[PDB]
Design an enzyme around this catalytic site. Structure first.
Site, short mmCIF file in Angstrom:
data_model
loop_
_atom_site.label_atom_id
_atom_site.label_comp_id
_atom_site.label_asym_id
_atom_site.label_seq_id
_atom_site.Cartn_x
_atom_site.Cartn_y
_atom_site.Cartn_z
N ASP D 91 -10.28 9.22 4.20
CA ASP D 91 -9.08 8.63 4.54
C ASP D 91 -7.95 9.35 4.09
O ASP D 91 -6.91 9.65 5.02
CB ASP D 91 -9.15 7.15 4.29
CG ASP D 91 -9.89 6.32 5.69
OD1 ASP D 91 -9.87 6.63 6.65
OD2 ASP D 91 -10.61 5.37 5.04
N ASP D 193 5.68 -8.89 -6.63
CA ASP D 193 5.39 -7.53 -6.71
C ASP D 193 6.23 -6.69 -5.74
O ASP D 193 6.75 -5.66 -6.22
CB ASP D 193 4.04 -7.25 -6.47
CG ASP D 193 3.30 -8.14 -7.78
OD1 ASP D 193 3.69 -9.01 -8.47
OD2 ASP D 193 2.32 -7.65 -7.90
#
Ligand SMILES: NC(=O)c1ccc[n+]([C@@H]2O[C@H](COP(=O)([O-])OP(=O)(O)OC[C@H]3O[C@@H](n4cnc5c(N)ncnc54)[C@H](O)[C@@H]3O)[C@@H](O)[C@H]2O)c1
Ligand SMILES: NC(=O)c1ccc[n+]([C@@H]2O[C@H](COP(=O)([O-])OP(=O)(O)OC[C@H]3O[C@@H](n4cnc5c(N)ncnc54)[C@H](O)[C@@H]3O)[C@@H](O)[C@H]2O)c1
Ligand SMILES: NC(=O)c1ccc[n+]([C@@H]2O[C@H](COP(=O)([O-])OP(=O)(O)OC[C@H]3O[C@@H](n4cnc5c(N)ncnc54)[C@H](O)[C@@H]3O)[C@@H](O)[C@H]2O)c1
Ligand SMILES: NC(=O)c1ccc[n+]([C@@H]2O[C@H](COP(=O)([O-])OP(=O)(O)OC[C@H]3O[C@@H](n4cnc5c(N)ncnc54)[C@H](O)[C@@H]3O)[C@@H](O)[C@H]2O)c1
Lengths: 314, 311, 313, 309
Positions: D91, D193
């Site tokens: 990928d 985050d």
């Protein structure tokens, strides 16, 4: 026993408390007047008060001369080599949850009961409002108050020991790395899984509503003996947080076929690095943190859930 | 535990075993006959439910009928099994073990669960080489897991059920939302609006509670669970409460429709505005014998049945 | 085109609207006064007003003779007997979200724009406040209003019944206390078999509905998509999925399945599907135009903030 | 148009392809033999091949003198020149391809060697027939959307990303506070985050790790997903592809934030910096094996184990 005098869920003193440690939120502005008022009141009944050395050196507390007359009666400790573990009867905390965590940092052994005060914003571990604080402090001193025995995790880092005590969790994650993190976790010497993602949030019940809750962990009352294991965005659709008995051994290492190192943090501080040859060992500590509750444990937990986390609103 | 029954100690040698078979099944007949013939060559009394003996497929064979006559028969009508069985062997899968908890509303003898094909979270024993396993358990060398159960009382304006996995309050034919109030130690903790809640045991943590998003709790963790069924609120995270608390579920005064209560996926009752459900932690756990130890069996069940963290 | 006269995102009338449908929340009490006020105001501009027959037979609608002179000017229609169809320029809804759903039930083909009102309820698809409703209805009549074209699902049950659903169609298990096994085909290919309570295959406007309670993501009504989200599966991996709106869905019972299944259309009349039954789902060519107070995005986010409390504090 | 010659969902070449770019997954010992075999085959139909300069710099590529004669016909480089791309490695290679083509992207034929992969559907076995079929023009593609990202510093820098853009915290251990605007309207601020604003192709990526749903690459939308938000009700959302997103730091924010594009070079944003995200007009066509939906569900089945047992 918790501290030289305090002991135990009600709170008993046996000997009348005379040493109190007040912990301030360090750099802040709204916590100067309440700190001064609380320190002035606590020495009107001839009771020893302890203050961090870094608090008395603040420019905004030496400038005022009205408070300086009573400030000279502070049993100051510098934290460089001072062991105040066997010198404090109970603790009053000002500022929020991060203060309480710091209160657990100074006491790696038995810790005296704490009385957290919230002054602005909202705190999950800070149930006491500063209004009418005289009566509440007096009732705490007399010995009519209930506490919760919050569990802590004993964590040991072996590098090829550091012996930390943590309150909310210990986090093993990735720092500057932008790739997946492969961390092997063992329970009682048996490999249970390898986490492949940002990291793990192995925590305590009182840390269930902390960063663990952000990653999808359930809400766990601090009156159950348990240890959480919660990922941080795992690259797997079927890795849910798990709850394990408090009496088990946890170990955490880097898998042999892993790229990049890992980074371990304790309650958001002491952020260090673990390589292939390092290991982390986690157990349930024998030294809980007693935090005095305003009315009772369950009601305070649920009101904290309602106000802070908005649990089941409308 | 039983009349004579964390390790397992027998004190007196076991002699009365109850074998519970999964009804309306065909692959279980041969293992059932094999196990029954083996259990009656050590002169050990065996118990079988009456409905099993009247099955046409078991009366048609005269080879098994010679040893069938030594069965001790109970019909669940008036011959309720009581403190007469000190060892349980279960055949069929998970739902069999639940039935084993239904038959014993008090103290329960240790149970052996066999997975005769398929997969079961609460069935750790493979039927292959079962002679050695049953012999070792009879001797007294086996560890057990004390699975907690919930004591439930239904008050209508008492029922006294003991449940193993959970108690589910939900809606039946109703297609609208359901509003039910929950009390913890006589205090309004929340009202849930949706399908219902799945208040459960740790054993039920991997059950229908897990389907709704609940976490995984080891059966050695003493706590009660509260998880919803698709609530119309993004914030209602499942919660875990101490085992010593008392829960009280009712219908809110401003609630449309009635609610339905089910115990371990069994007989369903209807509760109206004047009805209440009281849930506590039972003092009679379910001792389940483990193949090697609790933790490894639990994690193998997670890996094999629920595919917890595959690849 | 949307209705006999309304057409199109801005709303263009072409011909001046004259026929209006007001839909009430049936058994209610706080809605009688606003309903009466709206009906009296609507016919001072010579607007033909249509009302459900069951509404005009309510006990507390003829006991007041002040409103009696108003009820004589309603083009009454009855359910299941007279089809209103292409006779209404735009609709006004009172009561809450479900009313809008009922508005979708009466129009199985092209549907006129709807001006939903929230009365005593907050509502996700009801953005108009009843205060100062005269100016709002006048502005809508003039033709200065934005429209959100909400997609609908066309569903056929083969046992030849056709339905158009707005929020979702739910294939689940009812009185059964066991797991439900149903098979889903996408363009004739077995994509999944689900073992649990059921599936909540839904439109984008139904994303914040019962689909959201099951863990579905928030889907803006301006994206062309069809959702597939479960109801408590016995698998930790079956995350809800989103598929293109131009696909064919076909749901059946698996050959090795116990019990039957139950299909519900927008929380309404429930049917039972057996082994020989099939459910075919596509995206309809007749969306529901919903007038918005400011614009689709801000109204959607305001609804998320108020109703569902999305990201509070 | 997609590349100098390729155009369109079927793929039509108009002019016969003659230039092909092969991308290798950097240092991977398992890909040397497939790389040599593919390069030898591609230059038996007199078709020009392109290779990264650093691939030929590999110490273990000139030691074998058998491949040296084949090597000397590489159109090495250290746009508007490549008809289609063949990818080897997994990928992360495909993302790198999107990095090389900031504008129009020629069709890509990704191969999975030694890895399973989500965006790499072609097995290397019998690759001769597959490459021949692709060259002839009998193949279907999926138009994977990309995000155009502009970073404004108080110095414009444009980027085209394929999976997502991540605005998170770096070395900071405290929560990150960042504001997101849609069409000039402050929709929310996130307290945690960070955010995983992504494409449908990135729906199965790091966005899926944070709880986002899977969206088929044929559905035009832009996803917004948190990273462990400090709130129980911040469900991930989708928005129409035609909207404009603008991410900044809130005025009352401690610490800075770090922006990462597809898991690549990380930049730092101060209070005066802004990130503008839109849907790019240059999608990445990736050739599929049999058809889009079945390949997507196959990838869900064997990569993420979606609904197993
Ligand atoms: N994504 C997140 O939500 C996130 C990220 C990093 C750290 N944290 C947590 O922050 C803590 C470190 O505190 P700090 O030094 O930033 O001080 P702080 O008081 O500023 O804590 C930060 C925020 O977390 C809340 N919080 C802290 N402990 C909590 C608890 N036990 N339950 C519920 N909410 C709690 C605080 O009220 C505050 O809103 C650690 O417990 C860590 O897990 C959370
Ligand atoms: N959506 C769901 O997951 C769902 C729905 C209804 C009922 N249930 C469960 O079904 C049970 C009723 O028993 P039955 O005999 O009618 O069905 P059963 O015994 O046929 O069980 C059906 C499935 O659930 C699994 N299962 C059952 N109990 C389990 C447990 N404690 N932990 C993990 N997996 C478990 C079984 O292995 C099987 O895969 C109850 O435990 C109830 O919670 C689950
Ligand atoms: N567990 C659940 O949340 C649940 C269960 C059953 C049905 N539903 C929904 O109820 C509806 C049936 O209509 P009714 O007339 O019986 O309900 P209703 O009009 O009585 O409204 C019920 C609740 O659902 C909300 N709602 C309805 N449609 C919505 C939508 N599209 N987006 C967001 N919120 C929406 C309403 O605001 C209200 O809070 C269907 O949309 C169905 O999906 C939800
Ligand atoms: N926590 C996580 O899951 C996580 C963390 C960081 C980065 N990522 C992803 O890693 C990629 C960075 O590229 P890289 O050079 O590291 O490549 P890589 O191949 O090294 O990516 C690592 C893993 O992610 C998978 N992956 C990548 N893109 C995917 C997609 N669109 N769908 C499904 N799986 C996919 C890969 O197959 C591999 O298993 C970005 O897509 C980013 O989102 C994921």
């Amino acid at each position: 026993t918790f501290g030289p005098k305090a002991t135990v869920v009600r709170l008993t003193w046996n000997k009348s408390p005379k040493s109190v440690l007040v912990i301030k939120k360090m750099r802040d502005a709204s916590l100067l007047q309440p700190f001064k008022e609380l320190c002035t009141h606590l020495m009107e009944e001839n009771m020893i008060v302890y203050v961090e050395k870094k608090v008395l050196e603040d420019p905004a507390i030496a400038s005022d001369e009205s408070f300086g007359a009573v400030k000279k009666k502070f049993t100051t400790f510098r934290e460089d080599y001072d062991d105040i573990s066997n010198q404090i009867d109970f603790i009053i905390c000002l500022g929020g949850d991060g203060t309480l965590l710091y209160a657990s940092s100074l006491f790696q052994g038995s810790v005296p009961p704490v009385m957290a005060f919230h002054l602005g914003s909202l705190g999950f571990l800070t149930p006491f409002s500063f209004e009418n604080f005289q009566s509440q402090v007096t009732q705490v001193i007399e010995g009519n108050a209930a506490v919760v025995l919050r569990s802590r995790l004993k964590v040991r880092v072996v590098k090829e020991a550091m012996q930390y005590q943590v309150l909310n969790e210990v986090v093993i994650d990735r720092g500057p790395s932008s790739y997946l993190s492969n961390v092997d976790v063992y329970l009682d010497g048996h490999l249970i899984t390898t986490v492949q993602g940002d990291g793990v949030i192995v925590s305590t019940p009182t840390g269930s509503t902390a960063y663990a809750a952000a990653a999808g962990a359930s809400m766990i009352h601090p009156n159950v003996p348990a240890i959480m294991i919660t990922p941080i965005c795992p690259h797997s659709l079927s890795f849910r947080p798990i709850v394990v008995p408090a009496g088990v051994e946890l170990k955490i290492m880097l898998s042999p076929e892993a790229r990049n190192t890992a980074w371990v943090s304790f309650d958001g501080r002491k952020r260090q690095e673990i390589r292939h040859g390092d290991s982390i060992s986690i157990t349930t500590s024998t030294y809980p943190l007693p935090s005095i509750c305003v009315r009772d444990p369950v009601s305070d937990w649920f009101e904290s859930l309602a106000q802070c986390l908005h649990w089941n609103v409308r």
